[PDB]
Amino acid sequence: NSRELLLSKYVNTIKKDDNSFRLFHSIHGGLCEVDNEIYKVLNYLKKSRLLTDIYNEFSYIDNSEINDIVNEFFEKGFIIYNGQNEIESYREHEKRRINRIETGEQIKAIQLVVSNKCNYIYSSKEREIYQKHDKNQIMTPENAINYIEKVIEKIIKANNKELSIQFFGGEPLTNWNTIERVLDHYKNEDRLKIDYSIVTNGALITPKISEYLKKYNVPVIMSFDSPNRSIKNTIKSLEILKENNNYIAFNSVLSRDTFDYFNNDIVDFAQNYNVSEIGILLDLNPSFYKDFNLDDIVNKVIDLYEYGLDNGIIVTGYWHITYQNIIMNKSIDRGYKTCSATGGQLSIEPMGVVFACKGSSGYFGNMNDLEGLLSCENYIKYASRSFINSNNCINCELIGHCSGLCLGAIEKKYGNIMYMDKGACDLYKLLIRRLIEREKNIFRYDID
Ligand code: SF4
Numbered sequence: 161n162s163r164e165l166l167l168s169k170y171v172n173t174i175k176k177d178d179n180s181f182r183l184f185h186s187i188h189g190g191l192c193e194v195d196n197e198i199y200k201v202l203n204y205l206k207k208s209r210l211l212t213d214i215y216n217e218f219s220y221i222d223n224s225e226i227n228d229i230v231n232e233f234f235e236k237g238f239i240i241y242n243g244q245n246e247i248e249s250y251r252e253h254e255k256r257r258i259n260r261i262e263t264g265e266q267i268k269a270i271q272l273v274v275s276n277k278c279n280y281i282y283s284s285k286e287r288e289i290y291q292k293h294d295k296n297q298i299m300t301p302e303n304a305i306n307y308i309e310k311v312i313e314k315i316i317k318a319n320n321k322e323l324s325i326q327f328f329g330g331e332p333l334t335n336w337n338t339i340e341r342v343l344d345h346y347k348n349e350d351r352l353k354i355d356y357s358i359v360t361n362g363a364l365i366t367p368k369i370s371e372y373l374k375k376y377n378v379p380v381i382m383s384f385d386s387p388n389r390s391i392k393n394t395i396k397s398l399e400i401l402k403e404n405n406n407y408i409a410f411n412s413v414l415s416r417d418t419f420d421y422f423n424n425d426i427v428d429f430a431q432n433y434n435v436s437e438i439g440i441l442l443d444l445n446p447s448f449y450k451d452f453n454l455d456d457i458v459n460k461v462i463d464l465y466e467y468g469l470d471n472g473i474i475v476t477g478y479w480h481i482t483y484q485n486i487i488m489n490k491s492i493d494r495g496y497k498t499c500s501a502t503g504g505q506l507s508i509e510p511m512g513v514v515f516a517c518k519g520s521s522g523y524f525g526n527m528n529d530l531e532g533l534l535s536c537e538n539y540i541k542y543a544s545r546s547f548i549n550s551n552n553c554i555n556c557e558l559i560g561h562c563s564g565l566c567l568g569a570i571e572k573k574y575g576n577i578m579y580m581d582k583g584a585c586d587l588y589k590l591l592i593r594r595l596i597e598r599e600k601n602i603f604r605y606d607i608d
């Protein structure tokens with residue numbers, strides 16, 4: 161709280177031209193563009209300055225304008241008091257969250273694995289055991305409601321006001337009975353707001369199911385990929401969903417296997433069927449980031465993203481959550497960045513066993529002992545790297561925005577969820593940098 165001021169070392173610069181500098185903070189975000197005069201003021205603060213020194217250094221700018229610039233970028237966290245340790249301040253968020261883990265207030269989401277069957281990777285003992293188990297195949301309505309109720313009772317004691325519940329599987333519509341019973345059971349819930357979603361291949365969608373998903377305002381995330389290496393049934397399901405004005409997203413994979421087939425046609429298809437969003441999942445196999453040219457990966461993502469923007473379709477994915485956090489911070493209040501499995505999610509299997517995520521091998525415990533689940537070492541280990549993935553990340557421009565490569569992938573490759581995958585990191589950094597370079601709706605400060 162002194163008087164000497166300092167440009168934060170976490171402020172990153174992407175120069176667009178000699179009068180345009182795009183700036184963001186590696187922890188906080190705050191993406192914006194500044195003109196040359198404001199950039200000169202910020203850079204003067206690389207050495208600690210008193211405000212009156214900035215006045216005299218410039219002074220061809222009115223003091224009152226210099227004061228406006230300094231105050232705006234202080235509030236953004238781009239200018240700090242000399243001596244402030246910003247990474248220790250960020251890490252305090254992590255330590256506070258770890259210290260309060262027994263409250264359960266960090267639990268924001270249930271991934272409700274209602275079926276492990278599909279219609280007609282892993283690296284732990286517990287996955288082998290329960291993927292096979294005959295009582296872990298179909299979640300009963302009674303067990304589903306009980307599991308959810310245990311979570312709700314815990315988090316409302318922490319005064320949590322919201323909870324997301326994602327119906328997940330194998331193919332969740334193989335267990336519509338349990339989904340429908342859960343929706344009906346909680347229809348009058350008033351202790352907190354429940355938000356639902358469902359991830360499906362959509363093959364089993366009927367007018368009745370579609371009307372019911374709409375009634376409960378359940379966004380439908382449908383797997384879809386362009387022809388590679390069927391579509392009539394996908395069109396049949398989309399036409400049903402669109403008729404009832406359901407919210408539809410596609411989930412598409414950009415991987416070694418889809419790379420040459422991944423193109424912008426999916427946006428034209430989406431617009432035709434009133435699909436609002438297209439999620440792009442980047443390959444979970446780390447060899448993708450060694451074997452494919454990173455600039456070509458980036459261009460495939462950015463081309464789809466920009467053509468989507470031109471067509472009113474939200475092209476998204478974890479990489480886009482990272483980019484949006486760089487514009488407007490939402491991760492601090494959520495307690496996690498793009499991966500909710502770092503303590504924020506309980507992935508509940510039919511027999512009540514609980515993992516970090518269906519994408520992860522991390523076994524937490526069993527819903528018959530939720531307090532034991534939240535106190536166990538594996539749960540603590542996953543929850544402890546939510547804000548800072550690894551000490552690999554401390555000097556990275558994405559530290560406050562990026563969760564690294566999926567837990568399941570680094571579990572398999574390194575046996576260590578703190579071991580960041582360098583190839584994937586390189587891609588993330590290239591992608592975010594290109595998104596910033598190409599942003600058309602940046603907020604720009606001009607000196608006055
Ligand atoms: S995981 Fe990699 S890209 Fe992401 S913040 Fe850490 S070092 Fe940076």
Ligand code: SF4
Binds near residue numbers: 501518565
């Ligand atoms: S563990 Fe993988 S699949 Fe699960 S939320 Fe994290 S990144 Fe996504």
